[PDB]
Design a protein around this ligand. Structure first.
Ligand SMILES: COc1cc(CCO)ccc1O
Ligand SMILES: COc1cc(CCO)ccc1O
Lengths: 237, 300
């Protein structure tokens, strides 16, 4: 059934699974028309499909042309997400396909279940966790590839860089979710923390800076402070 | 006008004949029911006084044979049987009528209720849902499960309603996933009507039979079937206009007949609010929506 704090370690066992987050699939700017009405302008989006054990990020870029001439775009976006996830599973060899797909929003359950009827042995699950995957577009290199796309495109990243050489997937996921929670609560501060020191670089093939183990402790501490700080700035505490 | 005689009434029982019921006391001198209108199916049904558990009964059509009821003390219920000796039967009934030992099917002349509840129900279709081919009549009770219920345990005793499942490959064309799930017209018109039921009359017959088993026997799987068949039409954008008008009439008389105190168990809040207020056919069921709002406004 639903994925929550009680069964959190299931994410790092050896049954292949994927998280699917659709928050950034349908993205718009709202503006005034010359007549003083309001309209939307879509911008490129992305499906965030993540294997939490390996860090595999399948970033399906959703180009604005997929919305042309379509109605009820927020509803379509969920079915388009489910169509693209289903297509991804089908492309993979059997031994590499997931045994579970965890959707981060419950409105994705029926669209994905319907597109996956051909796969009765893949479990489609919701979660009670509030995961901060919406903040994926605050990662500079992910945002860059989405906005530059001129056509539909799938781009592959490891969202953990090389961390699994040194830490477990439980710890890597915890680091990822702390970084993303921070970027979501105060993007400017979070990004100041991560780049403040010009001597720590992001390798060309990475998403995050090349911190030592000790520097990651400092970074992780600074991100907790930020989240608590913003929690006080927000609630006056 | 036909007759269903009873050998006797050895145990105290409430006996239903379609929407009418009467109480019979232990060893009361009751020998059956006369003046049953020809031209419709009927259902005789029972609830024992000592054990209101298991309402049960028999669907029958007096045009298909001479049927009587006899209590079986081994199996503990009133059983329907067919009498093949025509002159025996006629002579039994005439004696019981002469001694006035039978209740009269108590239909008011103005009253089309039973016709309106059974318009599309035929015995031959009932016997394909309820499989017991050596009898011309069909037994149903409160606990019998449906084939679909069993897929989710005795097959001989199942209600073989047509399986309807909105998240199934039968309901969803490859490459029409969103279209077919949000608009079930394909599944209604092509899969079910053209493919399985052949026409809307057979579909309505099964819908009506499911409702009657749900109301008379509190059969939960029958109630699931009735609501699924309503929801499949209401969730279709493209429905023949005669079917919508007929559906409104069918449901109207089902809701009208339904006792007020059973609504909490026999009516699914989600299906009815969806069907009357959100679905494609939200504006197509004027009679049903008006009786639902005046009789069960709490549900909505
Ligand atoms: C081997 O590393 C990776 C592999 C994939 C493809 C797995 O289907 C995606 C991202 C990765 O980092
Ligand atoms: C006679 O038995 C019953 C009759 C009705 C319909 C009354 O309009 C509902 C439930 C019953 O058991």
């Amino acid at each position: 059934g639903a994925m929550n704090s009680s069964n959190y370690a299931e994410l790092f066992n050896n049954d292949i699974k994927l998280f699917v987050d659709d928050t950034n699939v349908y993205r718009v700017t709202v503006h005034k028309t010359f007549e003083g009405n309001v309209a939307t302008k879509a911008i490129n989006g992305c499906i965030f499909t993540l294997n939490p054990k390996t860090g595999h990020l399948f970033l399906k870029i959703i180009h604005t042309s997929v919305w042309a001439g379509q109605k009820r775009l927020s509803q379509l976006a969920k079915w388009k997400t489910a169509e693209e996830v289903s297509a991804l599973v089908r492309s993979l060899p059997k031994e590499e396909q997931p045994k579970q797909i965890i959707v981060t929003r419950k409105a994705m359950l029926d669209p994905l279940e319907v597109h996956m009827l051909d796969f009765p042995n893949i479990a489609i699950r919701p979660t009670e966790l509030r995961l901060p995957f919406s903040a994926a577009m605050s990662i500079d290199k992910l945002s860059d590839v989405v906005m530059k796309a001129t056509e539909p495109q799938m781009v592959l990243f490891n969202i953990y860089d090389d961390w699994l050489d040194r830490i477990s997937s439980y710890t890597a996921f915890s680091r990822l979710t702390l970084l993303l929670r921070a970027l979501k609560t105060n993007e400017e501060s979070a990004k100041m923390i991560l780049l403040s020191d010009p001597t720590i670089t992001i390798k060309s093939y990475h998403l995050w800076p090349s911190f030592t183990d000790e520097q990651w402790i400092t970074i992780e501490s600074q991100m907790r402070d930020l989240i608590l700080t913003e929690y006080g700035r927000k609630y006056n505490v | 006008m036909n007759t269903v005689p009873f050998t006797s009434a050895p145990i105290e029982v409430t006996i239903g004949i379609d929407q009418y019921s009467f109480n019979v006391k232990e060893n009361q001198p009751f020998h059956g029911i006369k003046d049953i209108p020809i031209g419709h199916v009927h259902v005789i049904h029972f609830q024992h006084a000592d054990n209101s558990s298991m309402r049960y009964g028999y669907w029958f059509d007096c045009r298909m044979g001479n049927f009587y009821i006899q209590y079986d003390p081994k199996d503990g219920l009133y059983k329907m049987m067919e009498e093949r000796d025509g002159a025996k039967f006629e002579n039994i009934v005439h004696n019981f009528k002469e001694r006035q030992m039978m209740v009269s099917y108590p239909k008011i002349d103005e009253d089309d209720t039973w016709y309106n509840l059974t318009e599309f129900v035929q015995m031959d279709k009932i016997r394909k849902i309820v499989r017991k081919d050596e009898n011309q009549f069909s037994y149903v009770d409160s606990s019998m499960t449906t084939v679909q219920e069993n897929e989710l345990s005795d097959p001989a005793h199942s209600l073989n309603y047509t399986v309807i499942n909105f998240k199934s490959r039968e309901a969803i064309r490859p490459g029409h996933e969103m279209e077919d799930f949000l608009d079930k017209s394909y599944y209604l018109n092509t899969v079910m009507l053209q493919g399985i039921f052949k026409n809307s009359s057979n579909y309505f017959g099964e819908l009506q039979f499911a409702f009657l088993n749900a109301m008379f026997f509190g059969n939960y799987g029958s109630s699931l079937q009735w609501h699924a068949m309503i929801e499949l039409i209401c969730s279709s954008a493209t429905v023949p206009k005669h079917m919508l008008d007929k559906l409104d009439e069918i449901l109207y008389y089902q809701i009208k007949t339904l006792p007020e105190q059973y609504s909490d168990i026999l009516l699914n809040e989600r299906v009815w609010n969806i069907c009357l207020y959100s679905s494609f056919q939200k504006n197509s069921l004027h009679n049903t929506e008006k009786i639902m709002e005046n009789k069960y406004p709490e549900l909505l």
